[PDB]
Structures are given as C-alpha cells and as structure tokens.
C-alpha cells in the first residue's frame, strides 16, 4: 500500500483521530452513537488518486 509522505508533501498535517471530520453530520463523535454534527467537506482521507 501507499500512505502520505509527510516529509516530501508540502502541506502535510498530522491530524489525530479527534479532529477528522468525514461523514460529518451523519455519524456520532468517536462512538457508535446516533448521528450528530453538520455536513461539511472532509479532512481525513488524504487523497492518493486523481
């Protein structure tokens, strides 16, 4: 597999689990609870295609 190359990427940002918003407004915060939050573009999966 391949992952983000933190050294060579210009705008790398080591983002912990606490601050990754994907599927926001549709999944509970860090726990299999009910949905919460608002829709928003996302931050975490760093794209490796396109």
């Amino acid at each position: 597999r391949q992952v983000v190359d933190d050294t060579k990427y210009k705008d790398y940002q080591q983002v912990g689990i606490l601050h990754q918003h994907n599927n926001s407004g549709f999944v509970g915060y860090l726990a299999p609870t009910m949905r919460e939050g608002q829709a928003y573009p996302a931050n975490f999966p760093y794209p490796l295609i396109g």
Partner: protein
C-alpha cells in the same frame, strides 16, 4: 513512527486524568523511594560487615603486642 491517540476519552473524562496523575505520583514515590532504600540498605549492610571484620582484626592486633 509515532503512535498514541488513547487520550481521547481521557480528555472526555477529567476524573480519569486526575486518577492517572495520582497513579503517576504514587508510582514515582514507590519506585524512587523503594529503589533508593534498597540500594542504601545493601550498601549499609556491606559496609557494616566490612567494618565488623576490620574491628575484629584491629582487636587481634591490639591484643598481640602487650606493651
């Protein structure tokens, strides 16, 4: 490499953080004090044994020259 995110519900729980701090303080006290006391007791025992042996030798030497 770096690996730790376990602080999530630690941030979500102030009491857990306080208990962890108390545990750290108790671990510090136990480890440091017990290690220091054990090393000191070992050193004191060795020195006392050597001192007793030397005292015996000095007593013998004193007895073996009756001025």
């Amino acid at each position: 490499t770096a690996r730790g995110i376990v602080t999530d519900f630690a941030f979500l729980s102030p009491l857990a953080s306080s208990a962890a701090s108390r545990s750290s303080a108790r671990d510090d006290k136990l480890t440091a004090l017990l290690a220091q006391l054990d090393s000191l007791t070992r050193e004191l025992n060795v020195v006392s044994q050597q001192l007793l042996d030397l005292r015996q030798q000095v007593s013998a030497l004193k007895a073996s020259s009756p001025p």
